[PDB]
């Protein structure tokens, strides 16, 4: 623990500064440090954790695709070697995040909003592994993503309203999992449509602030349906 000697509150303060500086690698290390303090995370802290690693892994995924595309076109070892380098570092980030979730974020998360959040993240990071998987564990990696998403979905449906932004973001990502990872485009479409319609019918219950939060994610579901249909 590089961050073992820094106060929890200082690590959270520094994560927030790192976000402002666009130093996402630092933001992610600071939030890793905070989780390793062993206390549960607040809503805000969960969002810091997620944003930090999304940003880190986002850069690696983007780099991977560029390198993978060049490699495909090329089909010397250099292209493959460098795509492998980036891929390995990507897998490491996913491994680290899954690490934090299993030791011990998920088992201590009893509230719907925390448990759903973490299980969604678990699905997400298995999905990122799945995006680069080519060998004898691909099927199991994919099934790990499905399993995580499905538990999250079951909890979300039982414990949260249809407009709950966490529930909506989960359905969005599970929908993309179906479309592109499980090669189940009809499932992806059905999930996205059903999720949008059930959210639309519940907007009447919300404040203006909540309405804004929900409709933002509903538009993402719409954006995908437009490309898909």
């Amino acid at each position: 623990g590089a961050m073992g000697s820094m106060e929890r509150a200082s690590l959270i303060q520094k994560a927030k500064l790192a976000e402002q500086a666009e130093r996402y690698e630092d933001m992610a290390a600071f939030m890793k440090g905070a989780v390793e303090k062993g206390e549960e995370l607040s809503c805000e802290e969960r969002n810091l954790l997620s944003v930090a690693y999304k940003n880190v892994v986002g850069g690696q995924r983007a780099a991977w695709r560029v390198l993978s595309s060049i490699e495909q076109k090329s089909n010397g070892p250099e292209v493959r070697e460098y795509r492998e380098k980036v891929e390995t570092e990507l897998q490491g980030v996913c491994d680290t995040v899954l690490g934090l979730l299993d030791s011990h974020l998920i088992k201590e998360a009893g509230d719907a909003e925390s448990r759903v959040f973490y299980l969604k993240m678990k699905g997400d990071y298995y999905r990122y592994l799945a995006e680069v998987a080519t060998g004898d564990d691909k099927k199991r990696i994919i099934d790990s993503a499905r399993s995580a998403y499905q538990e999250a979905m079951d909890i979300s449906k039982k414990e949260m309203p249809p407009t709950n932004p966490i529930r909506l973001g989960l359905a969005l990502n599970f929908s993309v999992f179906h479309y592109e990872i499980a090669n189940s485009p009809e499932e992806a479409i059905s999930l996205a449509k059903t999720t949008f319609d059930e959210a639309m019918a519940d907007l009447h219950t919300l404040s203006e602030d909540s309405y804004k939060d929900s409709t933002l994610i509903m538009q993402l579901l719409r954006d995908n349906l437009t490309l898909w249909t």
């Binding site: 997620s50 986002g58 995924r61 997400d124 993402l220």
Partner: peptide, 12 residues
């Protein structure tokens, strides 16, 4: 690759 909308920062 065409990337679909997923939750949170469009960091890729």
């Amino acid at each position: 690759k065409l990337m679909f909308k997923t939750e949170g920062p469009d960091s890729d």
